[PDB]
Amino acid sequence: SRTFGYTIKRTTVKTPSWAVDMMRFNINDFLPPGGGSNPRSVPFEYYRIRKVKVEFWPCSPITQGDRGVGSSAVILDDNFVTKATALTYDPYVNYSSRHTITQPFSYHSRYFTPKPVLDSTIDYFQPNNKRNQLWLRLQTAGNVDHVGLGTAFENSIYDQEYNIRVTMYVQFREFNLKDPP
Amino acid sequence: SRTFGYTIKRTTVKTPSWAVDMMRFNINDFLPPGGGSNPRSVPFEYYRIRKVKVEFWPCSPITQGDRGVGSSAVILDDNFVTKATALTYDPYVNYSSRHTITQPFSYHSRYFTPKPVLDSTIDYFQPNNKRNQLWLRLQTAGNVDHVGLGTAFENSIYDQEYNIRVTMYVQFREFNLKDPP
Amino acid sequence: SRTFGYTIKRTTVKTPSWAVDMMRFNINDFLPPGGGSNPRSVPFEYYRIRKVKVEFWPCSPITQGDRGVGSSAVILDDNFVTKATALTYDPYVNYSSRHTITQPFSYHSRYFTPKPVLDSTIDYFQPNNKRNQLWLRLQTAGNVDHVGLGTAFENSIYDQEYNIRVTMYVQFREFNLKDPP
Amino acid sequence: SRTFGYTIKRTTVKTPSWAVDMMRFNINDFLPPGGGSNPRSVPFEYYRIRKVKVEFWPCSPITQGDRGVGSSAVILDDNFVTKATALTYDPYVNYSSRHTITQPFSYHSRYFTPKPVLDSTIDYFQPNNKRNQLWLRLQTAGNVDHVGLGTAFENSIYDQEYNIRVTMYVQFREFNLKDPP
Amino acid sequence: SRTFGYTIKRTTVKTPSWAVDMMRFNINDFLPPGGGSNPRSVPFEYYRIRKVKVEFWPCSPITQGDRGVGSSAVILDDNFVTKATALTYDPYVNYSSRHTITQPFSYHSRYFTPKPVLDSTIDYFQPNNKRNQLWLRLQTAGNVDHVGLGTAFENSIYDQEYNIRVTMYVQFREFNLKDPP
Amino acid sequence: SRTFGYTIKRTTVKTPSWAVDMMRFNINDFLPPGGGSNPRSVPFEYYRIRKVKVEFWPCSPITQGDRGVGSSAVILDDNFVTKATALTYDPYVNYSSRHTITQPFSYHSRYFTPKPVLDSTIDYFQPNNKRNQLWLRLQTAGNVDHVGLGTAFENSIYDQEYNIRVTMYVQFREFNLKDPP
């Protein structure tokens, strides 16, 4: 439920090279600190996540050409590729649940479900849309970081400024409020 | 969802005189201050109230006699009687929806629904258990005060100390959270 | 399947302050060491836990007054509140699956299902009453500690001594016995 | 669930003489000592026995000849014959529930139910496979000895070495565990 | 999908002592390194395991005697027994899902499903044959080690050489290929 | 599953002349070299091709005029026309399964199935969408070249830059992996 500026730097190379990026989810950013006997603005003992209606709302006009195509392959098992300002290939082009990345003015969105990362070394995760979703706990500091979607915009001569937006849905349960004197 | 000490001072008079009291409800006491872009610990635009399972949990043992009887007449239209340390009558004895006040160790509770007080001079209120319940708004300072139950414990030679408890139920709707940088 | 003395120290403060406590479950305490080729008194390769019929059997007589009220909120995600000899509020009063803590002579009990704590920093757990209960293993030393119930008795002038009792149910399977010469 | 070496000494006599043996069952051998407040590795107040899938797993190869034949007559009433290194007859050949003893490499097994021996002089026993099976008690020292199967291998010029194995099934009930401090 | 030489050293002791072993599974051994933009010979984002048709194909002829018997108990919770060149007992003889170990020329096999080991200290695992199987990820270096079957061959005077073979089944899904210039 | 730059050089001629091109398919380009005992990144003994969702994703903006029209006639029997920088006719205009080539910003795509070319002189091919599809074999060097779609963009005064993209679907079968030491 936030936005941030992610401008892709142009390149002079003639070959249409890609520029992979990264988008790590974080629940702490979707809630500011609290006060008194309630450090968290949303007090709850347990909470779950169903889906996240992600969307990469563009900002360039329709007159700007340099339109390309890509493949926003979903990522969850934690295994991003080495970042490069001008990649000479598209590693996310070969995938089952792929999606054509229409740019620039063309609207594009995705839908999936993220899961927490237990250990940074082994990196575990639960299946998608299932009743066996491992519950979590509320924490303002020691909080993990969920994996987002794998973007891959194609470079061009002109600049590019996007406005990524996410709507992390939450299903809180078993509230725990404190009303001191 | 809180408690407070309300000890009834004994009296030397032989006639069993009563001692009316007052219990004004307040939603601000059921939530502490917030912080940052969320002054309230419970962010929501609208909320309603259904019922309040009030209960006057006693604290005296069974060996302590001086047991009497009263009538906890419900009050909502705002019209309490003049407080008196030793009232020579029970004005709440004559009522339709009365309830035998069994004291001391005997457990006693009530169930009703409160409503906000628009003006202190005219004092308006909505009907009980109906779909036409006028909604309210969240406010940490400028908040009204709902009317509670009309208590009336009978005096005695020995002291008395109760532990009043209320479970003000709330039905929030249309959340409004703020997640600044 | 054991008991221990947990006496709540009295206080002179007039305001009815609470005194939160802690009850951490441990399977190693429910079985002493073994001998020979069977260090464990109950040999089994796998075992599960369904429910634990907890109960806080009191010990004070009925003649002792100072009766109060509380709320035994269930805890499993590991997030106890800072211990205090005389807390000026009840953080467990606001909860969904709450339970009125009737004291002293009044009997009170609860029923829930515990789960193991994988990591001490993230703290994970499985859902309640489900076929996806993650199995465990038998170990006399390297054993985790399950989370218990969240108690919250109210202070008083007179002393207080309870006799907590638990019946941790186990469902062993796939025995592994050793019968050396 | 144990094994032991029972080698039959060869003989020079030309006549094919038999060599009866003995196999007394014992529950104490199927469980080592305990420790602390649990001297027995398997704590239980009552236990029963249904069947024992006995088997005499051989060890000689198929190239070794000198194959004979016998009759493994069941024994339970306690009445073994005088042991002899080279018996000139087969007393177990005449029986109702007999079984051809195929040796050496040929596999052979039997199935019966043992019963405890009350007195050593009278020697009593209960019927086979019936609901009136007299229950027993757990004891690490003062334990009786059940009667096994009546073996009768035929002598030969070459040596012989078998690997007897028994799977004494148990049906424990009414556990009695101790969890001291 | 590999084989290795595991010869059991003979012993001079007369008592038939066992010799427990260990067999740890590893997915890295079932795939060699890659090259270029595909370090793994089998590119896939997610993969699962159903069953592993293990088999201990012997190599000794039928003329070799010294045949015994054992019990290949399944192991998954990580709890192997101390290795011994000549164990005076069989700890895997008492088990529910046991299997008679017929040696030498006699063929023997087993069927089960392994699971990954999250932590070496606590050692967790998922249930057998269930839809809640926790998925994994592809990794050529930082890869865990699954638990195999618990073998227990009996010693003998003559040597012994087996040819263990496994067919670790895999159900890859969501391919991720890279085809750079 | 790749992209390449194919810019059509402008022309000064007033008559709207066409500029035919060529697009030869190759499976070797959709897979990089391997290593060790797996020269191919995708090991499989047999594989087939169903369809190829071709698409000529444009890159010019909508403000750029000079829009024309053509006919992307399918080609498979190997019989391209002589290339010309400015053809004074459209040989692909007369066809049964034709398709209006809408340019520039207008999206256009096609769908068909290619087949291998046995000999370069006779040039054979199999029917479309049929169960009699002749299978092939995996090869990194000696691999044939399939025929693509017949493009025919109309010239113009302004430049033109398209981003051709193809998704060659494959249906591998009968895997053949090698896991040496």
Residue numbers in the entry:
A (entry chain D), B (entry chain C), C (entry chain K), D (entry chain L), E (entry chain M), F (entry chain N): 50 to 230
Provide the authors' own sentences about this structure as they appear in the paper:
The PCV2 capsid protein is the only protein responsible for PCV2 capsid formation and the dominant immunogenic host response. These structures show that PCV2 VLPs are assembled from 60 copies of PCV2 capsid proteins with the icosahedral symmetry and several exposed loops located on the viral surface, which may serve as the immunodominant epitopes eliciting neutralization antibodies.
Roughly 9,600 particles were used for 3D reconstruction, which reveals a typical PCV2 viral capsid structure at 4.12Å resolution with an icosahedral T = 1 symmetry comprising 60 capsid protein subunits. The local resolution distribution was assessed by Resmap/Chimera, showing significant resolution variation ranging from 5~6.0Å on the outer surface and inner concave regions to 3.5~4.0Å at β-strand barrel regions. In our cryo-EM structure, the density of each capsid subunit is clearly visible even at r.m.s.d = 4.1 Å, showing a typical circovirus capsid protein fold consisting of eight β-strands joined by several loops located on the surface of the particle. The N-terminal fragments, such as fragments 15PRSHLGQILRRRP27 and 33RHRYRWRRKN42 surrounding the N-terminal NLS region, are clearly visible on our cryo-EM density map contoured at level of 3.6 e/Å3 (r.m.s.d = 3.60 Å.), suggesting the relative structural rigidity of these N-terminal fragments. There is no density map available for N-terminal fragment 1MTYPRRRYRRRRHR14 due to structural flexibility at this region, strongly suggesting that this N-terminal fragment may not be essential for icosahedral capsid formation and stability.
